[PDB]
Amino acid sequence: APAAVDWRARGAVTAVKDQGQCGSCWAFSAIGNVECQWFLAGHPLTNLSEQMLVSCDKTDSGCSGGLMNNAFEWIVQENNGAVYTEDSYPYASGEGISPPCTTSGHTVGATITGHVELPQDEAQIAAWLAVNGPVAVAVDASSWMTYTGGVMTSCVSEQLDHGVLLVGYNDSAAVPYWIIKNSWTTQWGEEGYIRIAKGSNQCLVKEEASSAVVG
């Protein structure tokens, strides 16, 4: 696989978002993956709805958390493969209450037929992403309140608890790194992003990586 990949540079990544006072990381990770996999299947880049998943997906638990894998399945199985647009189902859980599910008066912005779950291997994950696009991953983020920039290298880690999006990597660098999109606004980290060290399972980045498939 190439030396460096960065799907923002190829127009595949929408702007950084804000989950607010809601534990919906898993929804933003899932959606940001779709947003990008959609685009890379010949469609134009559209902002899609997290609020759809927080409110309507009952396999997960809205602002008290969930996993990306369940979010992909609910889209497919329960919601007929559809993902509404952010515009026709805007995000409304920033104050901390997820308001109730509404099943109509929206607009479908994208569609999926399923998802793959990548093996627990950084290099295979890297290889895949080089070709197929961004990858939703689980990580330990117990200690990211502190993160101001640079390439996180220490990240000792006891469990998975945050969802985010791999959008790239760079193996030339003295410290090789992943490029990860987060949903805590452009204030946090490097304009909303974080680099973590690639090749030592930093923050448990390999452990629960997956992605949607647009048919």
Ligand X SMILES: *[C@H](CC(=O)N1C(=O)C=C(OC)[C@@H]1Cc1ccc(-c2ccccc2)cc1)[C@H](CCc1ccccc1)NC(=O)[C@H](CC(C)C)NC(=O)[C@H](CC(C)C)NC(=O)[C@H](C(C)C)N(C)C
Residues in the site for ligand X, rule: CB under 6 A?
23, 25-26, 61, 64-68, 138, 141, 144-145, 160-163
201 assigned to active site: no
Whether the Cβ atoms of residue 164 and residue 25 lie closer than 8 Å to each other: yes
Closer Cβ to ligand X, 109 or 115, answer by number: 115
- What's the longest Cα–Cα distance across the chain? 51
Show Cβ contacts of residue 66 under 8 Å, excluding neighbours closer than 6 positions.
26, 27, 53, 57, 59, 60
Which residue in the list 36, 56, 182, 203 is annotated as catalytic? 182
Q: How far is the CB of 26 from ligand X (least distance, A)?
A: 4
Beta bridge partners of 192: none
Q: How far is the CB of 136 from ligand X (least distance, A)?
A: 8
Show Cβ contacts of residue 186 under 8 Å, excluding neighbours closer than 6 positions.
16, 192
Q: How far is the CB of 4 from ligand X (least distance, A)?
A: 26
Which residue in the list 69, 162, 170, 203 is annotated as catalytic? 162
203 assigned to active site: no
Which residue in the list 22, 25, 63, 203 is annotated as catalytic? 25
Stated length of the chain: 215
Closer Cβ to ligand X, 5 or 141, answer by number: 141
Closer Cβ to ligand X, 157 or 170, answer by number: 157
115 assigned to active site: no
Q: How far is the CB of 106 from ligand X (least distance, A)?
A: 24
Q: What is the DSSP letter of 48?
A: B
Closer Cβ to ligand X, 14 or 183, answer by number: 183
Closer Cβ to ligand X, 55 or 111, answer by number: 55
Active-site positions read: 25, 162, 182
